[model samples]
Target: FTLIELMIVIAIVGILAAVALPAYQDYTARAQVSEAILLAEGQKSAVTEYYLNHGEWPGDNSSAGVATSADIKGKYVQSVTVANGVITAQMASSNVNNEIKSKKLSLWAKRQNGSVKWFCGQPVTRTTATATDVAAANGKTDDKINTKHLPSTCRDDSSAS
Candidate 1:
C-alpha cells in the first residue's frame, strides 16, 4: 500500500510539472518582451513629435533623443537600433523561445494616403522623407505584420499600414 501511494504521488508530480513548465516559460517570455517594449516606449512619442513639428521624421536615434545602441540595457533585449526614422528591438539569444529570440520587433513612421502616422511591426525599408513619397514607396509586402510576440502598444495596426 505504501509503495503504491508513493508511485501515485510521483506520477501526479510529473503531470503537474509537464503543465506548469510550459506555462511558466511563456510567462517569462512575455515578461521579457514587455521589458523590451518599455525600453522603446519613449521612441514612439519622440518620433511622432519630430514628424509633427519638423515636418519630417528623424534620421537617427540621436535626432529623437534615443541612444544609437541599447538605451535601457535590458537583459532580455540584446540591443536597440534607431535609424532612418525606425526603431528595431532585437531580442537576446538567451530567451527561452527560439522563434521570439531570433526575430526582432520594428517600429517606424509610415505615410499612407498622404498622412503621416506611426506604425509598428512593419519592416523598415524606405528612406523617403516626405509622406507622399513614403506612401508610394511602401508596398503591401512590407506591411504584413505578425504581432504575436509584440507588446500591446507595439502591436501592428492593420488599418494604419
Candidate 2:
C-alpha cells in the first residue's frame, strides 16, 4: 500500500510539472518584461514631476533628480533613461527570452487634462482608442518583440494606432 501511494504521488507531481512548466516559462518571460517596467517606475514619476513642476521634460536622467541611466540597470534591463518626458528602458538579454533580447521598451508621458498620462502600445482587444493617443504613447515600433510575452497593456496595439 505504501509503495502504491508513493508511486501515485510521483505521477501527480509529474502531471503538475507537465501542465504548469510550459505556461510558467511563458510567465517567466513575461516577468522579465514586467521587470523592465518595474525598474522604470521611479523614473516615470520623475518625468511626471518634471513635467508638472518645471513645465517641461527632464533634459536627461541626471537633471531629472533621479538615478542615472547606468544606475538603473537591472538583471534584464541594461539601462533606464529619463529624458524629454519619456522613460525608456533598454532590455538586457541575460536570463531573458532571446526573442526579446536587447530591445527598448518605453513609457511616454502626455498632458492629460490637468495631469500626466503614460502610454504604451495598444491591446489586442480594443480597436477604438484614438490614433492620437496610441501614437503619442506608442514606443514599441522600434523594438517590437513577442506580443504574447509583454504586459497586456503594453502589447502591440498598432491596429488601433
TM-scores for every predicted model: 0.62, 0.65
lDDT of 1 by residue, 1-161 (tens): 69999999999998988874345545555667776666665677777787778877677777876776655457777776666566666677664355466346666676566765666653454465443222222454422224555556666643455
- Predicted structure with the largest lDDT when compared to the true one: 2
After the best TM-score superposition of candidate 2, give how far the Cα of residue 19 lies from its true spot, in angstroms: 11
Please report the candidate that would top TM-score against the real structure. 2
Report lDDT (Cα) of residue 106, candidate 2: 65
lDDT of 2 by residue, 1-161 (tens): 79999999999999988884356656776788787778777677777677668766776777788887878888888888765655677788566777667766666655666656566532212122221233433455646546676788875443332
Model 1: runs farther than 4 Å from truth? 1-23, 95-99, 110-117, 131-146, 157-159
As a whole number from 0 to 100, the lDDT of residue 160 in candidate 2 is: 33
Sequence-dependent TM-score of model 2: 0.65
Q: Compute the lDDT for candidate 2.
A: 0.65
